[PDB]
UniProtKB/Swiss-Prot annotation:
Keywords: Lectin, Metal-binding, Repeat, Zinc. Alpha-L-fucose 6 binds at W43, R281, E295. Belongs to the fungal fucose-specific lectin family. Alpha-L-fucose 1 binds at R24, E36, W93. This is Fucose-specific lectin.
Amino acid sequence: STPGAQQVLFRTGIAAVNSTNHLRVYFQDVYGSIRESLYEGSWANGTEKNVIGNAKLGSPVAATSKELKHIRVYTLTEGNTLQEFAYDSGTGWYNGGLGGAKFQVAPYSCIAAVFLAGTDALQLRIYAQKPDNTIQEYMWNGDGWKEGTNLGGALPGTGIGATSFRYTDYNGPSIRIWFQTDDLKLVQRAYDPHKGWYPDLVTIFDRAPPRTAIAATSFGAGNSSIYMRIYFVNSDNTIWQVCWDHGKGYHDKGTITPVIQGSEVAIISWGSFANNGPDLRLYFQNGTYISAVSEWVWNRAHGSQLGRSALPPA
Ligand SMILES: CC(=O)N[C@H]1[C@@H](O[C@H]2[C@@H](O)[C@@H](CO)O[C@@H](O)[C@@H]2O[C@@H]2O[C@@H](C)[C@@H](O)[C@@H](O)[C@@H]2O)O[C@H](CO)[C@H](O)[C@@H]1O
Ligand SMILES: CC(=O)N[C@H]1[C@@H](O[C@H]2[C@@H](O)[C@@H](CO)O[C@@H](O)[C@@H]2O[C@@H]2O[C@@H](C)[C@@H](O)[C@@H](O)[C@@H]2O)O[C@H](CO)[C@H](O)[C@@H]1O
Ligand SMILES: CC(=O)N[C@H]1[C@@H](O[C@H]2[C@@H](O)[C@@H](CO)O[C@@H](O)[C@@H]2O[C@@H]2O[C@@H](C)[C@@H](O)[C@@H](O)[C@@H]2O)O[C@H](CO)[C@H](O)[C@@H]1O
Ligand SMILES: CC(=O)N[C@H]1[C@@H](O[C@H]2[C@@H](O)[C@@H](CO)O[C@H](O)[C@@H]2O[C@@H]2O[C@@H](C)[C@@H](O)[C@@H](O)[C@@H]2O)O[C@H](CO)[C@H](O)[C@@H]1O
Ligand SMILES: CC(=O)N[C@H]1[C@@H](O[C@H]2[C@@H](O)[C@@H](CO)O[C@H](O)[C@@H]2O[C@@H]2O[C@@H](C)[C@@H](O)[C@@H](O)[C@@H]2O)O[C@H](CO)[C@H](O)[C@@H]1O
Ligand SMILES: C[C@@H]1O[C@@H](O)[C@@H](O)[C@H](O)[C@@H]1O
Ligand SMILES: [Cl-]
């Protein structure tokens, strides 16, 4: 290992945000602090100096952005309330208003977060699990944090993945979330502006490890068209990918890369098939320097490859 890698919590929550190939990755250190590593032509940071706040040890870590102008990082307090670390260009980092609402969630809750797509407005949707094991949506629409739609029961401790996109023929954003139910299946719920939340769950994987990590992205929105990718840790101790492609639906799935038992997972993307992409980056723990965070890359030029073997501070 390295003194650097040893600072990274084993099975840390992982999140990532980007503006094309300008990357930020969030993780928890062994003292409970949330740190940011960065890629701006090369990897940097992830040190004691790149602390953006503190969270309960073992906390989920979620993040969403509007390019790198506005970044929001979500975690649990020691009291099992949702909290938020915020960055705005020109202001830097501060404690977001989410914590002030004191939303109490199950101590084992995960978190997902999206900015709503296709608007300049800063509108956020956060997904977590309440003590009754239901998935609750929380909303910011410019005038305080409020509860949104309750999305029903899920396996206690389920991973939660989420993405927002805007079809170019729609007048408003869509949302898709993924989670695990008590029967251990992985499922999708869906929100469109005309149907609201679709009544029924769509199964994307028949049986997954209990509380397996779940991470999702979408890209290349067009007229009533989208591409989506969902990742989770399967029982073979690897990340698997599930593929939605326009015109084919949920038509394929397969292993991507080995991880440590119980690794968490983050995904970012940019670009589209129509324009010499997309690009995909996955972050996870695969045992490099024991506890370092590693990267997997997909692009058009070279397809599937391992990227940075050990992210800063390793
Ligand atoms: C090794 C090398 O010199 N090039 C290969 C590498 O590409 C990286 C470079 O092309 C670099 C040029 O300045 O641009 C990088 O963006 C790219 O790296 C990858 O993407 C960035 C955004 C981060 O995720 C990096 O950790 C990641 O490695 O890798 C590519 C594709 O995987 C090609 O092999 C290049 O030949
Ligand atoms: C690549 C690099 O060396 N970045 C360092 C630099 O980053 C900051 C500058 O780019 C600055 C220009 O006005 O804007 C800052 O907000 C930016 O901060 C970095 O990017 C944003 C989006 C956040 O992710 C920040 O946490 C991150 O630091 O200078 C800073 C210190 O000011 C850091 O050393 C970066 O390493
Ligand atoms: C300038 C200022 O006083 N900011 C404090 C205020 O933050 C809100 C304002 O910053 C407002 C005007 O620019 O923008 C809001 O977006 C912002 O709230 C933050 O961003 C939104 C998208 C949500 O993520 C919020 O939870 C988050 O705070 O009030 C906050 C508390 O809400 C802080 O005190 C800011 O310093
Ligand atoms: C897959 C398909 O073509 N039809 C399903 C699907 O409905 C589609 C359909 O309404 C089209 C209209 O062009 O818009 C979407 O593709 C929609 O699917 C919804 O969004 C996609 C991105 C996925 O997340 C999908 O799971 C979701 O349902 O779903 C409906 C459910 O009412 C029916 O199952 C159609 O037969
Ligand atoms: C839509 C479809 O049939 N997908 C196949 C396909 O996927 C490839 C393929 O569409 C080529 C076309 O030359 O473009 C990419 O390689 C695409 O890859 C898929 O999307 C990228 C973003 C990644 O998520 C990657 O993991 C994924 O496979 O061929 C592959 C095998 O090479 C599969 O058979 C898909 O189901
Ligand atoms: C985008 C939509 O915004 C509000 O209407 C919420 O009540 C819905 O759950 C959804 O998040
Ligand atoms: Cl110093």
